[PDB]
Amino acid sequence: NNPAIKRIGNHITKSPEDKREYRGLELANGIKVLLISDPTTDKSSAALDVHIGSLSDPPNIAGLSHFLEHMLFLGTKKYPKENEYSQFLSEHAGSSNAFTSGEHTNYYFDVSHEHLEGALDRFAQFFLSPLFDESAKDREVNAVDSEHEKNVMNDAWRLFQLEKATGNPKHPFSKFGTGNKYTLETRPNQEGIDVRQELLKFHSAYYSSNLMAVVVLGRESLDDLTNLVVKLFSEVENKNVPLPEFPEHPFQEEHLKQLYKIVPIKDIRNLYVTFPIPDLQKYYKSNPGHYLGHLIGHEGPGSLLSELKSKGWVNTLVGGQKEGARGFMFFIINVDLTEEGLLHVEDIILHMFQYIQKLRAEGPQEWVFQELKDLNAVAFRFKDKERPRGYTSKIAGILHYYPLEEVLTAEYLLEEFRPDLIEMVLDKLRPENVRVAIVSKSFEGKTDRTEEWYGTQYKQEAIPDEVIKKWQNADLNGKFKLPTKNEFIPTNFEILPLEKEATPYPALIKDTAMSKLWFKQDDKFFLPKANLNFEFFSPFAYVDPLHSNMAYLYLELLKDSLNEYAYAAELAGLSYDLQNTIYGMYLSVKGYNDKQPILLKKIIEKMATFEIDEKRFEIIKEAYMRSLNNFRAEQPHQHAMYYLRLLMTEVAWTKDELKEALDDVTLPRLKAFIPQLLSRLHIEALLHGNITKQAALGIMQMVEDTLIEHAHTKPLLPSQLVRYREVQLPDRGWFVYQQRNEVHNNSGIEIYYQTDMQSTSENMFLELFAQIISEPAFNTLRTKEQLGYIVFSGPRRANGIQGLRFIIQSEKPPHYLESRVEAFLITMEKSIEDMTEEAFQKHIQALAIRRLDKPKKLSAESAKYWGEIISQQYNFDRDNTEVAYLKTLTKEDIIKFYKEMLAVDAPRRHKVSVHVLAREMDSNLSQAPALPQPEVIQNMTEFKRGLPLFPLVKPH
Ligand SMILES: O=C(C[C@@H](Cc1ccc2ccccc2c1)n1nncc1CNC(=O)c1ccc(F)cc1)NO
Ligand SMILES: [Zn+2]
């Protein structure tokens, strides 16, 4: 009966396993809405997607849409306090973010379920009368600048913008979307433009209700959620804006048959093949692009990748359709290159067209389409329950593209096989439509062009007629076959009954010298899935840099070897992860439980009986070398976190130590290493999901039996199972470690205040203190002082120890950042002494909500248990215990904690600082306190030698 509602879709197609309730509707002002009712959710959430993006930026103000997106957070007419939005979310267990693409601006938040209306109301205001405060504008432009600078020396962004720069300049596709101080402040000042008017002009003109989709999720009924949404959003004005479309492709004839040679920052070797194609979005019911991408990107036997990998030319391949905008898209084939591959780009591409030609010969395969359909069907039926925040943002995005009743299924289900469209798309993948780009350091000094925004060094050539002609005449290579029927498709979806002796938390159901087995039968989610987690402990995994390298290469080679076999299983919703740790090996198998034992057995056998291919060994090692080198190109704030991890751990091998020892890794030494590594192990496992206790025991026994039979594995001694300790810093100590980032012209800094061994009391002092300072830290260090885009504060936990950490990436020198953080702490000391008891309890409640938030999917709950197990703390009921203690803390308790552990003149202050200087830097408002002379760390080894080591935390 409501006049504010144009239409109400009551049957929203969902999965039969989804317990959440849905109602879609279209408001009178044209807003498409989806309501999600979940009476169990601990956090509520909303999201709004505007169908305008950076592609609609004014030509004279690059990055206006992105900039506008930052500004909406900084105040509205109804809520004028600059950080009201962020502070409210913080005080109620919430959080918020947004992003800008070429065609979308997407805003989202979550919050304690009891405060949805308050959050949603403050949120709705973003879209009616934001302030765009001139003072805030002048500040937040710096955050955007900082965000861009961060991307300037990043190879992904450089190539991203380079593609745009090599097509039609007249086309909106060529726009620089991020923006920076120049395009947002500096140039607009030369040209006398009022940026604040431009923000208001843009907001008013494009942020129309007809271009908006909204998704809200809470405990409230569908009826109540309707009243709430309608009340707040029907007030949004409808300017009846036409939806932008871009019918003309950014790549015209002059832009085809072109080759680009590009110099990267990292030492990487990549080949990009790109085919311009028509917008395939309408064909979404058949999805011709996904069909073709499925085949061209296949990694099993007979595939394009298989042959290229055997030729020793590539290691990995990506293929398929790539989004552009409304009216144009891309089909791409990207491979990485071996040293050999780099000298065979022409032959590689020939092989690409040979495979495409195979597809034309056989023509569309309906069983293939039918297979994809049925997998997606099963995928959708047994879909994991999503986290609200991401779910609402995802859906608010696609409401623009599908009927209300179809949004949930739209991105999952294939409906009708259309070979006519497949052939049509396949017809665009020809040499006369190709663009080729090669990324390699080998082009250094040989380029004649510069992209103006990032400065990328490149050369452009026309592909020779001879070569194009050669590609057009591609004969059928007998090495290329269509994929076989997927043998890993699951068939047994039976949910095993809950055993009588079943337990709420994992139970230790096996405890021998060989292995410690933790088991839980799923009692929450009831999907036909299981998680199998294994830690293999061995001293020889991390005993020195050389052996660390070999543990890595061992597992990489093993994965490279299994890829063809396991790729199918991956498509059938059964994946595995295998990586080396500082304690040995980690192996996880996740997915549909039906065929898990088959893949698991295959992996353990491959481990125990592995025969290294020498050609594969040389290639992977070479890549691993560059991998170590390329760390030089990581962000400063990452270098900072890295160096700190090195400093504070008992044992740690640096990139340089590893890279030197790499040269000494020969095939013989690796072949010797593996049987040595496997000879003595301890296995600690978590088996959690749709399995019974006997099944679990059976799985564990196979793993042991396989290792014993093929590798002659024997148990470790209990005395060999020592975990590493954390360096115990002296009272009132302050150490500083300094490094330079050779790639980036930003500086980084991490500050670590080491409190003490983890324990219920110490844990909750830190966590509560961190909760209280969280929002203020962001608002002060970034929003007010604008030190940088990346500003972070929070707990740090390692080796059973913990402390408070600040992480900042800035253009200012680290020694400056030091004072500002220190200045801030004093600000917080006074702020807390002032805050009301009611405000203090608010934070306690917020922290509690965050800690008690239930896991929504099996993998989240398993990760939670697994954390307790590898940490050797085994505190599975931790949350109830720790939250309960939390509620008994007082303001006076936290003040004592601060005055004793954290304050500048605290008796037990334990501070270490890592400073990463920018590329060009030199060696070195509220009032900042005076700081003591810091002990400059000259040498990590010398540093650790002079300090004691903490104990290890005792198990529960
Ligand atoms: O920049 C953006 C979105 C992010 C930028 C952003 C947000 C969070 C980050 C956390 C760690 C490191 C960098 C980060 C960068 N952004 N843009 N405008 C506001 C925000 C963050 N919004 C918040 O409400 C917030 C965030 C953190 C907090 F503690 C309290 C409130 N889109 O382009
Ligand atoms: Zn941003």
Author numbering: 43 to 966, 980 to 1011
Provide the authors' original text about this structure:
The zinc ion is located in the N-terminal domain, but key residues forming the hydrolytic site are located in both domains, resulting in constitution of the catalytic site only in the closed state. All of these results are consistent with the recognized role of IDE as major protease acting in the degradation of insulin and Aβ.
Our results show that 1,5-triazoles are much less active than the 1,4 isomers. Our structures provide the molecular basis of why compound 1 binds IDE tighter than compound 10 and 16. The 1, 4-triazole moiety allows compound 1 to complement well with the catalytic pocket of IDE, whereas 1,5-triazole makes compound 16 more compact (distance from the branching β carbon to F of compound 16 is ∼1 Å less than that of compound 1) (9.2 Å versus 10.1 Å). Compound 16 thus needs to be twisted so that only suboptimal contacts are made. The dislocation of the hydroxamate moiety from zinc ion (∼0.5 Å farther from zinc ion in 16 than that in compound 1) explains the reduced affinity. Interestingly, TGS formed the two possible triazole isomers that were shown later to display different inhibitory potencies and binding ability in enzymatic assays, crystallography and 19F NMR experiments.
